[PDB]
Amino acid sequence: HMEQGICGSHVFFIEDGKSKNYIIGKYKIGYLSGDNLILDPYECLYLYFKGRISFQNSDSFRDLFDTVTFDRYVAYEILKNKGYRVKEDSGLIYFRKGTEKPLSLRVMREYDRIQFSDLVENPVDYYFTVDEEGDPTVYSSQEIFPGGRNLVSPVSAPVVRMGGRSFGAGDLEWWIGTAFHGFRLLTENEANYISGNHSASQVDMVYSDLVGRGCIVKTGFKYGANFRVYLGRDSQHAEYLVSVMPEEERWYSISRGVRVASSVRKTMIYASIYKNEVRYVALKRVKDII
């Protein structure tokens, strides 16, 4: 007959006459309790797709599939097929190569509320995401410290608002502003900077912190970000794309940014005044893991 196990109220039969220890031995999952194999929701589902076990009741599959979510499941499977030892709990998916410290994966959903604070007090090493076509995406977020290699100087100039735009003299740091008939077309931020209003707003505070680091800040609107930043002198394209994370945030925004960024081969940086300081956090797609 078929040796069988159980996944919480769900009895299944091991296919092709395989010992319970075969499974345990081969997939490093589950355990024995009496003459039954005890599989957790994931493992059970996992093996079910492996064609390794059948179900007593028809509902079971669906039930367990609902129990664990598609998102969380796909993650489980991938990490599993890749080779890791997986284990979910506390609302996180832990995986290790074998005996080293595990790694926390955090399955996300476009409409989940994301916060900068979370990105800095990061309890998880990765953020996972599966799209509408079952395609997975892993991300990573770490506090960064932009290093501009540009000669910085204090710029306190006179600003004039005319025609609905702000302007300054045509000599300020060659890079600050734009050339317009001997004048210099300013951005609302650039105006506040040489105007001496660094505390105007949070985006202003970051703007200054940024320039002060040796970076050159130009508007990053053509990307949906507050600004683009060049780290070096002769920089053909801006390495960083920085955006100030507003009051409430939705993940797709984060997700979105990372895309329009990698596309233009730049890096998404999220700034915010965390604990009285202007810190930055880089978010990027992660390969290897999955």
PDB file of C-alpha atoms in Angstrom:
ATOM      1  CA  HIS A   1       0.000   0.000   0.000  1.00  0.00           C
ATOM      2  CA  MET A   2       0.985   3.681  -0.015  1.00  0.00           C
ATOM      3  CA  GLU A   3       2.822   5.067   3.009  1.00  0.00           C
ATOM      4  CA  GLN A   4       1.080   8.254   4.082  1.00  0.00           C
ATOM      5  CA  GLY A   5       1.732  11.336   6.131  1.00  0.00           C
ATOM      6  CA  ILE A   6      -0.290  14.289   7.314  1.00  0.00           C
ATOM      7  CA  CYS A   7      -0.186  18.048   7.030  1.00  0.00           C
ATOM      8  CA  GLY A   8      -2.422  19.325   9.796  1.00  0.00           C
ATOM      9  CA  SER A   9      -5.777  17.654   9.133  1.00  0.00           C
ATOM     10  CA  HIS A  10      -4.676  16.801   5.619  1.00  0.00           C
ATOM     11  CA  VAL A  11      -3.775  13.223   4.838  1.00  0.00           C
ATOM     12  CA  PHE A  12      -1.704  12.548   1.732  1.00  0.00           C
ATOM     13  CA  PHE A  13      -0.251   9.448   0.149  1.00  0.00           C
ATOM     14  CA  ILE A  14       3.375   9.113  -0.905  1.00  0.00           C
ATOM     15  CA  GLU A  15       3.522   8.207  -4.565  1.00  0.00           C
ATOM     16  CA  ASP A  16       5.369   5.394  -6.332  1.00  0.00           C
ATOM     17  CA  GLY A  17       5.826   3.438  -3.104  1.00  0.00           C
ATOM     18  CA  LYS A  18       8.491   5.535  -1.398  1.00  0.00           C
ATOM     19  CA  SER A  19       9.472   5.213   2.249  1.00  0.00           C
ATOM     20  CA  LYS A  20       8.746   8.267   4.400  1.00  0.00           C
ATOM     21  CA  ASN A  21      12.461   8.430   5.055  1.00  0.00           C
ATOM     22  CA  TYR A  22      13.004   8.647   1.299  1.00  0.00           C
ATOM     23  CA  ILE A  23      11.246  12.009   1.340  1.00  0.00           C
ATOM     24  CA  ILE A  24      12.818  13.124   4.545  1.00  0.00           C
ATOM     25  CA  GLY A  25      16.168  11.944   3.237  1.00  0.00           C
ATOM     26  CA  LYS A  26      15.847  13.392  -0.241  1.00  0.00           C
ATOM     27  CA  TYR A  27      14.150  16.780   0.396  1.00  0.00           C
ATOM     28  CA  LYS A  28      15.296  17.402   3.949  1.00  0.00           C
ATOM     29  CA  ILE A  29      11.764  18.256   5.016  1.00  0.00           C
ATOM     30  CA  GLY A  30       9.256  16.948   7.543  1.00  0.00           C
ATOM     31  CA  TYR A  31       9.451  14.322  10.298  1.00  0.00           C
ATOM     32  CA  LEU A  32       7.744  11.206  11.619  1.00  0.00           C
ATOM     33  CA  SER A  33       5.032  11.100  14.278  1.00  0.00           C
ATOM     34  CA  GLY A  34       3.855   7.581  14.743  1.00  0.00           C
ATOM     35  CA  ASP A  35       3.403   5.908  11.399  1.00  0.00           C
ATOM     36  CA  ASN A  36       2.737   9.241   9.710  1.00  0.00           C
ATOM     37  CA  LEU A  37       4.910  11.801   7.953  1.00  0.00           C
ATOM     38  CA  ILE A  38       4.396  15.298   9.280  1.00  0.00           C
ATOM     39  CA  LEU A  39       4.659  17.886   6.544  1.00  0.00           C
ATOM     40  CA  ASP A  40       4.071  21.575   7.035  1.00  0.00           C
ATOM     41  CA  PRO A  41       1.797  23.507   4.607  1.00  0.00           C
ATOM     42  CA  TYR A  42       4.673  24.552   2.303  1.00  0.00           C
ATOM     43  CA  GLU A  43       6.495  21.224   2.212  1.00  0.00           C
ATOM     44  CA  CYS A  44       3.266  19.419   1.556  1.00  0.00           C
ATOM     45  CA  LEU A  45       2.380  21.704  -1.354  1.00  0.00           C
ATOM     46  CA  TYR A  46       5.969  21.547  -2.479  1.00  0.00           C
ATOM     47  CA  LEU A  47       5.963  17.749  -2.708  1.00  0.00           C
ATOM     48  CA  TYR A  48       2.513  17.817  -4.252  1.00  0.00           C
ATOM     49  CA  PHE A  49       3.858  19.704  -7.252  1.00  0.00           C
ATOM     50  CA  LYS A  50       6.811  17.325  -7.344  1.00  0.00           C
ATOM     51  CA  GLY A  51       4.210  14.669  -8.115  1.00  0.00           C
ATOM     52  CA  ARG A  52       5.593  12.954  -5.038  1.00  0.00           C
ATOM     53  CA  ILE A  53       2.320  12.629  -3.069  1.00  0.00           C
ATOM     54  CA  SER A  54      -1.436  12.441  -3.623  1.00  0.00           C
ATOM     55  CA  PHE A  55      -4.340  13.661  -1.485  1.00  0.00           C
ATOM     56  CA  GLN A  56      -7.104  11.859   0.329  1.00  0.00           C
ATOM     57  CA  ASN A  57      -9.529  14.761  -0.100  1.00  0.00           C
ATOM     58  CA  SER A  58      -9.854  16.901  -3.225  1.00  0.00           C
ATOM     59  CA  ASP A  59     -10.156  20.160  -1.281  1.00  0.00           C
ATOM     60  CA  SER A  60      -6.847  19.707   0.526  1.00  0.00           C
ATOM     61  CA  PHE A  61      -4.678  21.046  -2.294  1.00  0.00           C
ATOM     62  CA  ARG A  62      -6.761  24.186  -2.716  1.00  0.00           C
ATOM     63  CA  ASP A  63      -7.153  24.542   1.059  1.00  0.00           C
ATOM     64  CA  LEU A  64      -3.403  24.390   1.667  1.00  0.00           C
ATOM     65  CA  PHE A  65      -2.788  26.562  -1.359  1.00  0.00           C
ATOM     66  CA  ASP A  66      -5.013  29.187   0.283  1.00  0.00           C
ATOM     67  CA  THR A  67      -3.482  28.557   3.700  1.00  0.00           C
ATOM     68  CA  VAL A  68      -0.064  29.616   2.431  1.00  0.00           C
ATOM     69  CA  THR A  69      -0.209  32.359  -0.162  1.00  0.00           C
ATOM     70  CA  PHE A  70       0.837  32.247  -3.788  1.00  0.00           C
ATOM     71  CA  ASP A  71       3.419  34.923  -3.096  1.00  0.00           C
ATOM     72  CA  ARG A  72       4.887  33.237  -0.029  1.00  0.00           C
ATOM     73  CA  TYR A  73       4.689  29.824  -1.747  1.00  0.00           C
ATOM     74  CA  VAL A  74       6.500  30.798  -4.958  1.00  0.00           C
ATOM     75  CA  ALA A  75       9.260  32.197  -2.792  1.00  0.00           C
ATOM     76  CA  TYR A  76       9.446  28.944  -0.801  1.00  0.00           C
ATOM     77  CA  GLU A  77       9.640  26.838  -3.935  1.00  0.00           C
ATOM     78  CA  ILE A  78      12.246  28.900  -5.711  1.00  0.00           C
ATOM     79  CA  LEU A  79      14.563  29.120  -2.717  1.00  0.00           C
ATOM     80  CA  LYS A  80      13.982  25.394  -2.298  1.00  0.00           C
ATOM     81  CA  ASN A  81      14.662  24.379  -5.898  1.00  0.00           C
ATOM     82  CA  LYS A  82      17.716  26.586  -5.848  1.00  0.00           C
ATOM     83  CA  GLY A  83      19.009  24.427  -2.998  1.00  0.00           C
ATOM     84  CA  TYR A  84      18.529  26.320   0.275  1.00  0.00           C
ATOM     85  CA  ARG A  85      17.107  24.964   3.495  1.00  0.00           C
ATOM     86  CA  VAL A  86      13.959  27.052   3.915  1.00  0.00           C
ATOM     87  CA  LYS A  87      11.699  27.747   6.868  1.00  0.00           C
ATOM     88  CA  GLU A  88       8.905  30.298   7.318  1.00  0.00           C
ATOM     89  CA  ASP A  89       7.667  31.763  10.591  1.00  0.00           C
ATOM     90  CA  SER A  90       7.139  35.074  12.372  1.00  0.00           C
ATOM     91  CA  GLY A  91       5.919  36.231   8.974  1.00  0.00           C
ATOM     92  CA  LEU A  92       9.340  35.877   7.366  1.00  0.00           C
ATOM     93  CA  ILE A  93      11.019  33.283   5.176  1.00  0.00           C
ATOM     94  CA  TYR A  94      14.383  32.124   6.453  1.00  0.00           C
ATOM     95  CA  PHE A  95      16.898  30.325   4.261  1.00  0.00           C
ATOM     96  CA  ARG A  96      20.506  29.180   4.673  1.00  0.00           C
ATOM     97  CA  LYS A  97      23.038  27.467   2.448  1.00  0.00           C
ATOM     98  CA  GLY A  98      23.414  24.747   5.056  1.00  0.00           C
ATOM     99  CA  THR A  99      24.492  25.608   8.592  1.00  0.00           C
ATOM    100  CA  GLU A 100      25.411  29.296   8.419  1.00  0.00           C
ATOM    101  CA  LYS A 101      23.241  32.102   9.765  1.00  0.00           C
ATOM    102  CA  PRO A 102      19.906  32.099   7.918  1.00  0.00           C
ATOM    103  CA  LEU A 103      18.723  35.015   5.790  1.00  0.00           C
ATOM    104  CA  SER A 104      15.356  36.722   6.089  1.00  0.00           C
ATOM    105  CA  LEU A 105      13.233  37.144   3.007  1.00  0.00           C
ATOM    106  CA  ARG A 106      10.272  39.540   3.221  1.00  0.00           C
ATOM    107  CA  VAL A 107       7.447  38.855   0.768  1.00  0.00           C
ATOM    108  CA  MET A 108       5.937  42.225  -0.169  1.00  0.00           C
ATOM    109  CA  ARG A 109       2.831  43.401  -2.026  1.00  0.00           C
ATOM    110  CA  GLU A 110       2.582  46.578  -4.100  1.00  0.00           C
ATOM    111  CA  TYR A 111      -0.030  48.070  -1.809  1.00  0.00           C
ATOM    112  CA  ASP A 112       1.778  47.425   1.476  1.00  0.00           C
ATOM    113  CA  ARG A 113       2.678  50.602   3.348  1.00  0.00           C
ATOM    114  CA  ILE A 114       6.444  51.127   3.232  1.00  0.00           C
ATOM    115  CA  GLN A 115       8.369  53.439   5.531  1.00  0.00           C
ATOM    116  CA  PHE A 116      11.941  54.768   5.521  1.00  0.00           C
ATOM    117  CA  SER A 117      12.266  53.817   9.163  1.00  0.00           C
ATOM    118  CA  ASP A 118      11.655  50.205   8.156  1.00  0.00           C
ATOM    119  CA  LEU A 119      14.351  50.412   5.518  1.00  0.00           C
ATOM    120  CA  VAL A 120      16.926  51.494   8.127  1.00  0.00           C
ATOM    121  CA  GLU A 121      15.977  49.350  11.143  1.00  0.00           C
ATOM    122  CA  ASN A 122      15.957  46.518   8.594  1.00  0.00           C
ATOM    123  CA  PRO A 123      15.340  43.209  10.353  1.00  0.00           C
ATOM    124  CA  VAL A 124      15.310  41.464   6.950  1.00  0.00           C
ATOM    125  CA  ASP A 125      18.132  41.087   4.439  1.00  0.00           C
ATOM    126  CA  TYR A 126      15.901  40.909   1.386  1.00  0.00           C
ATOM    127  CA  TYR A 127      12.484  41.922   0.094  1.00  0.00           C
ATOM    128  CA  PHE A 128      10.711  39.511  -2.221  1.00  0.00           C
ATOM    129  CA  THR A 129       8.072  40.099  -4.870  1.00  0.00           C
ATOM    130  CA  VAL A 130       6.187  38.002  -7.423  1.00  0.00           C
ATOM    131  CA  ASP A 131       4.374  39.746 -10.241  1.00  0.00           C
ATOM    132  CA  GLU A 132       1.289  38.891 -12.255  1.00  0.00           C
ATOM    133  CA  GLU A 133       3.236  36.458 -14.413  1.00  0.00           C
ATOM    134  CA  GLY A 134       4.700  34.597 -11.495  1.00  0.00           C
ATOM    135  CA  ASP A 135       7.995  36.402 -12.074  1.00  0.00           C
ATOM    136  CA  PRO A 136       9.967  36.921  -8.846  1.00  0.00           C
ATOM    137  CA  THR A 137      12.025  39.914  -7.787  1.00  0.00           C
ATOM    138  CA  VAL A 138      14.371  40.235  -4.841  1.00  0.00           C
ATOM    139  CA  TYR A 139      15.574  43.583  -3.530  1.00  0.00           C
ATOM    140  CA  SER A 140      18.103  44.790  -0.996  1.00  0.00           C
ATOM    141  CA  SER A 141      18.205  48.025   0.998  1.00  0.00           C
ATOM    142  CA  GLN A 142      21.219  49.441   2.858  1.00  0.00           C
ATOM    143  CA  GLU A 143      22.123  52.831   4.314  1.00  0.00           C
ATOM    144  CA  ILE A 144      24.442  54.550   1.851  1.00  0.00           C
ATOM    145  CA  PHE A 145      26.845  57.515   2.129  1.00  0.00           C
ATOM    146  CA  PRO A 146      27.112  59.366  -1.219  1.00  0.00           C
ATOM    147  CA  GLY A 147      30.693  60.389  -1.868  1.00  0.00           C
ATOM    148  CA  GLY A 148      30.973  63.341  -4.189  1.00  0.00           C
ATOM    149  CA  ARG A 149      34.421  64.035  -5.585  1.00  0.00           C
ATOM    150  CA  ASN A 150      33.570  67.664  -6.404  1.00  0.00           C
ATOM    151  CA  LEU A 151      35.172  70.842  -5.098  1.00  0.00           C
ATOM    152  CA  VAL A 152      32.504  72.458  -2.953  1.00  0.00           C
ATOM    153  CA  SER A 153      32.201  76.183  -2.171  1.00  0.00           C
ATOM    154  CA  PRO A 154      29.728  78.338  -0.224  1.00  0.00           C
ATOM    155  CA  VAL A 155      27.267  79.968  -2.646  1.00  0.00           C
ATOM    156  CA  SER A 156      25.225  82.842  -1.261  1.00  0.00           C
ATOM    157  CA  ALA A 157      23.744  84.715  -4.224  1.00  0.00           C
ATOM    158  CA  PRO A 158      20.851  87.105  -5.030  1.00  0.00           C
ATOM    159  CA  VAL A 159      17.761  85.513  -6.510  1.00  0.00           C
ATOM    160  CA  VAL A 160      15.046  87.158  -8.613  1.00  0.00           C
ATOM    161  CA  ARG A 161      11.643  85.699  -9.462  1.00  0.00           C
ATOM    162  CA  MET A 162      10.354  86.777 -12.837  1.00  0.00           C
ATOM    163  CA  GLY A 163       8.133  85.316 -15.522  1.00  0.00           C
ATOM    164  CA  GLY A 164       7.133  82.557 -13.125  1.00  0.00           C
ATOM    165  CA  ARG A 165      10.608  81.109 -12.685  1.00  0.00           C
ATOM    166  CA  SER A 166      13.527  81.958 -10.425  1.00  0.00           C
ATOM    167  CA  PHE A 167      16.857  83.229 -11.742  1.00  0.00           C
ATOM    168  CA  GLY A 168      20.337  84.059 -10.491  1.00  0.00           C
ATOM    169  CA  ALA A 169      23.459  85.729 -11.929  1.00  0.00           C
ATOM    170  CA  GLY A 170      25.285  83.981 -14.766  1.00  0.00           C
ATOM    171  CA  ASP A 171      28.410  82.928 -12.870  1.00  0.00           C
ATOM    172  CA  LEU A 172      27.401  80.687  -9.947  1.00  0.00           C
ATOM    173  CA  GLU A 173      28.970  77.218  -9.977  1.00  0.00           C
ATOM    174  CA  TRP A 174      28.921  76.445 -13.668  1.00  0.00           C
ATOM    175  CA  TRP A 175      26.723  73.440 -12.865  1.00  0.00           C
ATOM    176  CA  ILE A 176      24.109  75.121 -10.663  1.00  0.00           C
ATOM    177  CA  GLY A 177      21.178  76.245 -12.797  1.00  0.00           C
ATOM    178  CA  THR A 178      20.824  76.651 -16.565  1.00  0.00           C
ATOM    179  CA  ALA A 179      22.144  79.122 -19.147  1.00  0.00           C
ATOM    180  CA  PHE A 180      19.495  81.573 -20.338  1.00  0.00           C
ATOM    181  CA  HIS A 181      20.485  84.857 -22.007  1.00  0.00           C
ATOM    182  CA  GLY A 182      23.279  85.817 -19.629  1.00  0.00           C
ATOM    183  CA  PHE A 183      21.047  84.791 -16.713  1.00  0.00           C
ATOM    184  CA  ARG A 184      20.825  81.479 -14.890  1.00  0.00           C
ATOM    185  CA  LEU A 185      17.512  79.587 -14.784  1.00  0.00           C
ATOM    186  CA  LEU A 186      17.023  78.062 -11.373  1.00  0.00           C
ATOM    187  CA  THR A 187      14.990  75.203  -9.978  1.00  0.00           C
ATOM    188  CA  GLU A 188      12.902  75.864  -6.891  1.00  0.00           C
ATOM    189  CA  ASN A 189      15.518  73.918  -4.934  1.00  0.00           C
ATOM    190  CA  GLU A 190      18.561  75.660  -6.399  1.00  0.00           C
ATOM    191  CA  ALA A 191      16.926  78.959  -5.538  1.00  0.00           C
ATOM    192  CA  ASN A 192      16.453  78.010  -1.919  1.00  0.00           C
ATOM    193  CA  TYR A 193      20.067  76.801  -1.740  1.00  0.00           C
ATOM    194  CA  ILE A 194      22.012  79.888  -2.831  1.00  0.00           C
ATOM    195  CA  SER A 195      19.182  81.901  -1.314  1.00  0.00           C
ATOM    196  CA  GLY A 196      20.155  80.557   2.109  1.00  0.00           C
ATOM    197  CA  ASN A 197      16.940  78.713   2.987  1.00  0.00           C
ATOM    198  CA  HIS A 198      18.403  75.248   3.563  1.00  0.00           C
ATOM    199  CA  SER A 199      15.672  74.509   6.124  1.00  0.00           C
ATOM    200  CA  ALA A 200      12.815  75.492   3.805  1.00  0.00           C
ATOM    201  CA  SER A 201      11.758  71.852   3.500  1.00  0.00           C
ATOM    202  CA  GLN A 202      13.019  68.309   3.912  1.00  0.00           C
ATOM    203  CA  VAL A 203      13.890  67.996   0.234  1.00  0.00           C
ATOM    204  CA  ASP A 204      15.824  71.191   0.719  1.00  0.00           C
ATOM    205  CA  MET A 205      17.716  69.830   3.689  1.00  0.00           C
ATOM    206  CA  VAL A 206      18.719  66.769   1.636  1.00  0.00           C
ATOM    207  CA  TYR A 207      19.616  68.971  -1.341  1.00  0.00           C
ATOM    208  CA  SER A 208      22.159  70.837   0.759  1.00  0.00           C
ATOM    209  CA  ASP A 209      23.451  67.767   2.565  1.00  0.00           C
ATOM    210  CA  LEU A 210      23.877  66.337  -0.911  1.00  0.00           C
ATOM    211  CA  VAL A 211      25.737  69.200  -2.531  1.00  0.00           C
ATOM    212  CA  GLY A 212      27.873  69.522   0.586  1.00  0.00           C
ATOM    213  CA  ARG A 213      29.073  65.940   0.072  1.00  0.00           C
ATOM    214  CA  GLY A 214      30.798  66.838  -3.180  1.00  0.00           C
ATOM    215  CA  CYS A 215      27.880  65.795  -5.330  1.00  0.00           C
ATOM    216  CA  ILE A 216      26.296  67.880  -8.049  1.00  0.00           C
ATOM    217  CA  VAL A 217      22.518  68.034  -7.864  1.00  0.00           C
ATOM    218  CA  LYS A 218      20.319  68.489 -10.902  1.00  0.00           C
ATOM    219  CA  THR A 219      16.567  67.849 -11.033  1.00  0.00           C
ATOM    220  CA  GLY A 220      15.687  64.195 -11.615  1.00  0.00           C
ATOM    221  CA  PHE A 221      12.158  64.782 -12.897  1.00  0.00           C
ATOM    222  CA  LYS A 222      12.774  62.974 -16.183  1.00  0.00           C
ATOM    223  CA  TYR A 223      12.775  59.938 -13.919  1.00  0.00           C
ATOM    224  CA  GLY A 224      10.109  60.578 -11.313  1.00  0.00           C
ATOM    225  CA  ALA A 225      12.705  61.378  -8.670  1.00  0.00           C
ATOM    226  CA  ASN A 226      13.469  64.566  -6.771  1.00  0.00           C
ATOM    227  CA  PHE A 227      16.934  64.681  -8.297  1.00  0.00           C
ATOM    228  CA  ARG A 228      19.789  63.047 -10.148  1.00  0.00           C
ATOM    229  CA  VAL A 229      23.291  63.312  -8.766  1.00  0.00           C
ATOM    230  CA  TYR A 230      26.715  63.132 -10.359  1.00  0.00           C
ATOM    231  CA  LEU A 231      29.440  61.814  -8.025  1.00  0.00           C
ATOM    232  CA  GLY A 232      32.427  62.755 -10.146  1.00  0.00           C
ATOM    233  CA  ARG A 233      33.837  65.636 -12.137  1.00  0.00           C
ATOM    234  CA  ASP A 234      33.755  64.214 -15.653  1.00  0.00           C
ATOM    235  CA  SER A 235      30.619  62.146 -15.143  1.00  0.00           C
ATOM    236  CA  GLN A 236      28.818  61.473 -18.419  1.00  0.00           C
ATOM    237  CA  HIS A 237      25.670  60.193 -16.683  1.00  0.00           C
ATOM    238  CA  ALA A 238      24.354  60.630 -13.114  1.00  0.00           C
ATOM    239  CA  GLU A 239      25.179  57.576 -11.008  1.00  0.00           C
ATOM    240  CA  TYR A 240      22.454  58.235  -8.471  1.00  0.00           C
ATOM    241  CA  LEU A 241      18.791  58.904  -8.618  1.00  0.00           C
ATOM    242  CA  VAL A 242      17.617  60.238  -5.289  1.00  0.00           C
ATOM    243  CA  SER A 243      14.107  60.748  -3.991  1.00  0.00           C
ATOM    244  CA  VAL A 244      12.747  61.933  -0.659  1.00  0.00           C
ATOM    245  CA  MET A 245      10.374  59.385   0.831  1.00  0.00           C
ATOM    246  CA  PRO A 246       7.173  61.330   1.774  1.00  0.00           C
ATOM    247  CA  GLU A 247       4.929  60.859   4.818  1.00  0.00           C
ATOM    248  CA  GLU A 248       3.108  57.664   3.734  1.00  0.00           C
ATOM    249  CA  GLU A 249       4.581  55.352   1.098  1.00  0.00           C
ATOM    250  CA  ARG A 250       3.442  52.410  -1.018  1.00  0.00           C
ATOM    251  CA  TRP A 251       5.811  49.698  -2.166  1.00  0.00           C
ATOM    252  CA  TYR A 252       5.046  49.904  -5.887  1.00  0.00           C
ATOM    253  CA  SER A 253       6.601  53.349  -5.667  1.00  0.00           C
ATOM    254  CA  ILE A 254       9.793  51.799  -4.343  1.00  0.00           C
ATOM    255  CA  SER A 255       9.407  48.973  -6.820  1.00  0.00           C
ATOM    256  CA  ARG A 256       8.699  51.506  -9.560  1.00  0.00           C
ATOM    257  CA  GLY A 257      11.729  53.654  -8.832  1.00  0.00           C
ATOM    258  CA  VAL A 258      14.145  50.729  -8.851  1.00  0.00           C
ATOM    259  CA  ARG A 259      12.939  49.993 -12.389  1.00  0.00           C
ATOM    260  CA  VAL A 260      13.033  53.388 -14.108  1.00  0.00           C
ATOM    261  CA  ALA A 261      16.456  53.530 -12.468  1.00  0.00           C
ATOM    262  CA  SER A 262      18.120  50.269 -13.433  1.00  0.00           C
ATOM    263  CA  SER A 263      16.710  50.983 -16.875  1.00  0.00           C
ATOM    264  CA  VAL A 264      18.799  54.140 -17.143  1.00  0.00           C
ATOM    265  CA  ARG A 265      21.598  52.343 -15.297  1.00  0.00           C
ATOM    266  CA  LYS A 266      21.399  54.511 -12.164  1.00  0.00           C
ATOM    267  CA  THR A 267      20.834  53.635  -8.501  1.00  0.00           C
ATOM    268  CA  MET A 268      17.667  54.350  -6.491  1.00  0.00           C
ATOM    269  CA  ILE A 269      18.478  56.163  -3.303  1.00  0.00           C
ATOM    270  CA  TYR A 270      15.805  57.073  -0.776  1.00  0.00           C
ATOM    271  CA  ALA A 271      16.553  59.962   1.526  1.00  0.00           C
ATOM    272  CA  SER A 272      14.852  61.050   4.710  1.00  0.00           C
ATOM    273  CA  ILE A 273      15.657  62.847   7.970  1.00  0.00           C
ATOM    274  CA  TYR A 274      16.003  59.868  10.272  1.00  0.00           C
ATOM    275  CA  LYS A 275      16.900  60.750  13.827  1.00  0.00           C
ATOM    276  CA  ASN A 276      17.802  64.388  13.192  1.00  0.00           C
ATOM    277  CA  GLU A 277      20.089  63.404  10.291  1.00  0.00           C
ATOM    278  CA  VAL A 278      19.903  63.140   6.511  1.00  0.00           C
ATOM    279  CA  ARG A 279      20.665  59.505   5.761  1.00  0.00           C
ATOM    280  CA  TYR A 280      20.251  57.602   2.516  1.00  0.00           C
ATOM    281  CA  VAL A 281      19.265  54.059   1.666  1.00  0.00           C
ATOM    282  CA  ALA A 282      20.071  52.317  -1.591  1.00  0.00           C
ATOM    283  CA  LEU A 283      17.547  49.805  -2.956  1.00  0.00           C
ATOM    284  CA  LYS A 284      18.382  47.440  -5.797  1.00  0.00           C
ATOM    285  CA  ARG A 285      17.444  44.240  -7.572  1.00  0.00           C
ATOM    286  CA  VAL A 286      19.313  41.238  -6.245  1.00  0.00           C
ATOM    287  CA  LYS A 287      20.327  38.352  -8.498  1.00  0.00           C
ATOM    288  CA  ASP A 288      22.027  35.268  -6.968  1.00  0.00           C
ATOM    289  CA  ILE A 289      19.459  34.763  -4.212  1.00  0.00           C
ATOM    290  CA  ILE A 290      16.843  33.495  -6.682  1.00  0.00           C
TER     291      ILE A 290
END
